Write a protein that binds this ligand. Structure first.
Ligand code: HEM
Ligand code: HEM
Lengths: 119, 119
């Protein structure tokens, strides 16, 4: 019944770091490699985001990590295909692959995001 | 359906190198990064598989690259969760994350494989 849960379970143990957000940009799943990766990156990320806490991402909204929350919400709300954003956080480089997820009626369910730590 | 076509399309442009095989172990989709990655690794892979051609992988059966094709077929047909294999090809190391793909009725459709070139 839940497509997001099916995708999360299938991807839980793959190499690719994958985080899944719902339509409100709440983080609802993180696979094992992404949790581990963000744990390692935590020190560096704090230099720019001092209150960032990797152990507390599940159930957090991504707003809090965005200067202008209205911008990402509009972009993300309107995605028809993959969006490749590139972030520099505290000296660390990340490529994000943002993948819009739909049901069989074309109704948007949320976003699957691949993280790649380029550094 | 087609669930595989949806998956292939959603992943066509992600960073993760992804290849998709059907129930008969025919390669039916390759995303962009996996094609490029296998193109770069072609010379080395030829040292061990002299007839390997990265440009001719689409539609090929993977039997041809396996010493005991019956082994992989049995293994793959029976997967319920991710299978993590490690390959050495012409001195190159690859991690494969093999993800069994099911429809919402639990009927197996094929296999999505993430490739990572560890070298
Ligand atoms: C939860 C950890 C996350 C952190 C720490 C983080 C941090 C950032 C930062 C620092 C920026 C740059 C602008 C700014 O700082 O105000 C940014 C931009 C952006 N974020 Fe993320 N973010 C996270 C998760 C996500 C997720 C899950 C998505 C999408 C589903 C996303 C989508 C975007 C987009 C779309 C932009 C700007 C897009 C562009 O201009 O290309 N973020 N983020
Ligand atoms: C298309 C290019 C491919 C090449 C060149 C390749 C090559 C190989 C090689 C050399 C082996 C080791 C067995 C042996 O040496 O005979 C192997 C094993 C294996 N292959 Fe692949 N293969 C490819 C694609 C795929 C795909 C798409 C799948 C999954 C659908 C797959 C699944 C496996 C599995 C399951 C094993 C055995 C894993 C284990 O026993 O741990 N291969 N492959």
């Amino acid at each position: 019944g839940s497509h997001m849960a099916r995708i999360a379970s299938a991807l839980d143990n793959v190499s690719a770091n994958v985080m899944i957000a719902d339509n409100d940009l709440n983080i609802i799943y993180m696979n094992r490699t992404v949790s581990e990766m963000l744990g390692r990156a935590e020190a560096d990320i704090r230099k720019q985001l001092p209150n960032f806490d990797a152990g507390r991402l599940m159930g957090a909204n991504i707003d809090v990590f965005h200067k202008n929350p209205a911008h990402q919400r509009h972009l993300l709300a309107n995605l028809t295909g993959v969006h490749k954003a590139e972030l520099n956080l505290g000296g660390r480089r990340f490529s994000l692959d943002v993948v819009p997820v739909f049901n069989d009626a074309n109704a948007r369910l949320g976003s699957a995001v691949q993280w790649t730590d380029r550094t």
